[PDB]
Each structure stands twice: as C-alpha cells, then as structure tokens.
A paper describes a structure:
The de novo pathway of cysteine biosynthesis requires the conversion of O-acetyl-l-serine into l-cysteine, which is catalysed by cysteine synthase (CS). Crystal structures of the three enzymes were determined at resolutions of 1.80 Å for TcCS, 1.75 Å for LiCS and 2.75 Å for TthCS.
The active site of LiCS is found at the centre of each subunit between α1 and α5. Although the purified protein was yellow in colour, suggesting the presence of the cofactor PLP, no electron density for the cofactor was observed. It is likely that the PLP was lost during crystallization. As no PLP was identified at the active-site lysine of LiCS, this conformation corresponds to the apo form of the enzyme. In comparison, under the conditions of the assay LiCS produces significantly higher concentrations of cysteine than TcCS and TthCS, reaching 2 mM cysteine before plateauing at 5 mM OAS.
Numbering used by the authors:
A (entry chain A): 22 to 233, 260 to 351
B (entry chain B): 21 to 233, 259 to 351
The structure:
Amino acid sequence: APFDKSKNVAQSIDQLIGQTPALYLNKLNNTKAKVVLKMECENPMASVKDRLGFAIYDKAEKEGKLIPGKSIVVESSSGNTGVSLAHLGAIRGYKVIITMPESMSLERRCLLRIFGAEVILTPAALGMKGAVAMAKKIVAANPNAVLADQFATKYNALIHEETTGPEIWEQTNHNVDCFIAGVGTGGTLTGVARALKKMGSHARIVAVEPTEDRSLIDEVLCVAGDDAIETALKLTRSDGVFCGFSGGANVYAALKIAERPEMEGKTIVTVIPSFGERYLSTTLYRSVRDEVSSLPVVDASELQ
Amino acid sequence: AAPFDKSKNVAQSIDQLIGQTPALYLNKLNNTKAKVVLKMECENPMASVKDRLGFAIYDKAEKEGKLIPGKSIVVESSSGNTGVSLAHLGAIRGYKVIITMPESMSLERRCLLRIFGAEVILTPAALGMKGAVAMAKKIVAANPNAVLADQFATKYNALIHEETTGPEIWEQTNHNVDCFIAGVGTGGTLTGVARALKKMGSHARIVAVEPTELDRSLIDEVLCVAGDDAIETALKLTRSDGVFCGFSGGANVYAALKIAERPEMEGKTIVTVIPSFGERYLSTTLYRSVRDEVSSLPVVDASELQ
Ligand SMILES: [Cl-]
Ligand SMILES: [Cl-]
Ligand SMILES: [Cl-]
C-alpha cells in the first residue's frame, strides 16, 4: 500500500509528497457536469513540483547519477521546481545552486535561501535566458555539478504516470470523462494522460494554453490571462480553493467544457498545481492588495 | 466517525480535508536518544491548526442553532489564523464574515482575509485589540443576526483538539506517547490534546512551552523558550528536516529537543506540534535574517555570460 500518513509516523517529509486530496467544485459550478480538482496545492511545499523534485532525486540517485555530498545540483528556475529542488536537496545533503534574474521578487529569493540553496542573481535585461546561461556555465566549470533540467525532462511525465494519474483514477472511482491540465513544462498533463489511457479510460484529454505537440491531446483550449486571474479570485470566495494563475486557467477551462451538452452528468478532472499564498504579493492578487491598502479607519470617537 | 479517506475518495467540501494531518519524525536535527514526533498541523488546507477551530465553530454553532447559514453575519475581532479560517470557511458556507482589526496589523494579514471575501474593518492603532473588540460589539448591538465568533472560539477550542487532534496522535504513535509538548495561550492544542491523552489512560508528561524575549493539573512542566532560540530553530529546521513553520513551531521544536536530552527520555517518544506553515511569515521578522541576506546579493555582470 502507499504510506498511510493519516495513521503512521513518517520517517521523512518526502513521504508526505503526493497522495493529495481531490475535491468537487460546488458553488462555482452551475453546470450539469461534475468537476473534480486534484489538489496538488496540498503537497508539503505547496505545489505539484514537489513530485518532480522527489522524482529527480529519487530516480537520479537510483541510476547512480546523483551522489549525496558529492553532486552539486544546479537549476535555472525561479518557480516551484527550484523551490522543491532546494527543499529536498537540503534534507538529502546536496548543495543546491539556483540561478535567477535579479528582477524576481525578494520573496522568491527568500524561499530558496531558507533551504540553504545558493542563490545566484543574473542581469534583469537577460531575463531567464541569462539564468540558464549562468547555470550551464556553473556546471561546465565543475565536473561534480549537474543541470537538474536534464532530469526534469527525463522523469516528469513518468512520475505523473506512476503516481498522480493512478491516484486520480482511484479517487474518481475509475470514472473520468475529461482530463484538463496546462501545456506548460513540469506539469501533470502528459503523465496523467498516459496513465488514463493505460487504465482503459476513454477520458478526453484537454491541454490549456494561457493567453497571458502530443498524440495524447484531444483538444487545446486557449484561456485568456484575465479569465484565469478572475477565476482564481472567484474560486477562493466560492469554494475556498486558493491557488495560482495555472489553477485559475484550468478551472476556467473546466467550467467551459462543463457547459457542453455532451458533458451533462460526466466527470471532468483538472489540477490545482500550487497554493495561492505564494502569489499574494504578485499581480494575480494585486486587485485585493490595492483594495485593503486604502481602507478607511473607524474614528476613536465611535468606539465607546 | 466513518473518517474520510481523502487519499482515496473525492471530497464534497474542503472542510473534509481539515485534520487527519501527518506526523513526522525529526531526523537530522534530533541528535538525542529520544524519538521526536511532529504533528504537522501546517498541512491543513489553510496552512494552520486553526482550520480545526474554524471548522468546529461553524459545525458546532450551527448544530446549536446559533449560526444560521444565509442569515448570520460572523463577526470576528482577530486577524490571526483563526480569523483566516473563519473567513475561509464562512465564504464556502455562504456567511458574510466581518473582521475587525487595528490599522497597525500587517497589510499581508488584511490581504489574506480579503482574499476570502471578508469585510475587513480597521480600528485606530492607539486603541489596539480593545478598539477592534468595541467595533465588533457595535456591529452586533445593531443587528441581532450578527454574531460574535470569539465566544465560540473560547467554547470549542479545547474540545475540538480533544475530539480530533489528540486521538489522531494517539493512533499515529500506536498508543506510545511519553511526552506531549505544546505552547501556552489560547488557540493551542495543549489543553485538548492533554485531555484526550489522559482520557485514553496515558500518563505522558505534559510540557507547556512559554515564549519569552485544566491550566493547572494538566501541566507537568513549563519550559521557557527565548524568542531568539525559537527563531533560530525555525531556520535550522527548514535546512535539516525540510519543515517550514512559524515562531510557535520553532519554540516547540526547541522545547522538544531540550526534553529529548533528559536522561530519562532515552528511547522514549516525545510528540510536539507544528501549528502553521512558514510561508505566511516570510514578510515578518521571523525570517528577516534571510530577507536581509538575499536583499544584498550581488548580480552577475553581463560580461561573465558573454
Ligand atoms: Cl499540472
Ligand atoms: Cl496554480
Ligand atoms: Cl508555527
């Protein structure tokens, strides 16, 4: 059986990665279809990328390609893959180096540095291309250093075929008519689609392309940034799901699909990749920040 | 009970994901001969143990007929994790939630509450908590459908931890708890977990953690933890064990490590609590040492990449 974390004591926090909950969308869903959210936001470092981090360390160690205390893990990511690599690197005793443009927030730097990752900042003008350049440069310069990106490419779809997809299959009672996720790198889409196919599911596979190459994909749905953003704010207030831009896009897509006549009574599954708190000080929740920042204050004369 | 198998079913409400939190052994940071178990309340859906209290408030108050969905207005004079949980769970249940809070409380706290659609009302800094309380009172005095939530926090806090948190620890440790450690001050697991253990016939030592720099028979020992020790421990914990928490968790872990070095604790099991996830505190003084470090980092010159 997968580790029963609700009933036993874990030996390591990596045993808490995956086996995430699944949640019906209720108040926001005014259709005759069912929408299931795979709550990857509930991972220990608050995103789906914990699965990828674990896969990188676990599979690369098993191949003999990462050695704790010798290998230096180098990654040119600001986002959650870098966070997970830093997190799990710390506990497994790897030096982790993250390159990122200087333009990324202090918060993002801070998240990485709390785990003891070495944060290297690159010129704002060169953007992410410059961070990649720096990472490639650090690795060429040290034979013990490895680019983590090669492992992400090798293992990402596999970990989701092995874990996320089977979990969805069991949670939904072997009943999936449509699976929706982002076209991005480092997500569930390919691996979960493969798992569903292999289980004999006839689920329709929908890739979400945000407006702000596989034989597995049945349909690409383009979602405007402003719809993703608006959906994320509605989600918190309707169903208590607090996520990032990707999750809002996915839910928008799911609701659109759910309005189709042929989807009446069917089960649509989508993914909430990351918890929203990481994004509180970003553009996604700017509307809320701007609002509370200029509230009136009750006069002391009214408080007696 | 029929306890919800969330790794294996689809939940009808996010309330069902509250509780049934993991427990984790401290490894690299534990250099003692005792076992230290962390009850990971940071893994609740809104990232703190107070989700259990928010749930208890709505669940129990509704059963008492004191909260009526679609009619009651929930009025809460606090902006901490209990306030967050009330706003979060109120939204999904269809309640308007009002938070009264001093203007001096952090902008980030205001933002998180407003994310859930709470009405955030600010009161003068000079009047502090008492002005927020007076403002809550004023609202409720003018509308009989408005209800002060703090009465319910008082009534149900210890009870929900007796009913859920405590029994979960008991099961997770396979009925083997030699010591339970948690913070003083309301909102805590301490009283309710201690009561659960004692009902189960456990004679675990109960240690209250008191930060510096019933509420009698239940406590065997008080352990004073300096704020600096709590802070340093929180940052060590992230690097050693990958546990990312707030001040309270750092203090608890510091305390647990002190109990673990007691000779009579050799081979014993000590349980403590990680109340909340650390991300909420990244903009606070708890992680200021790290913010100051990363804010002064050098930037690689474009020459090096060309
Ligand atoms: Cl995804
Ligand atoms: Cl997201
Ligand atoms: Cl904490």
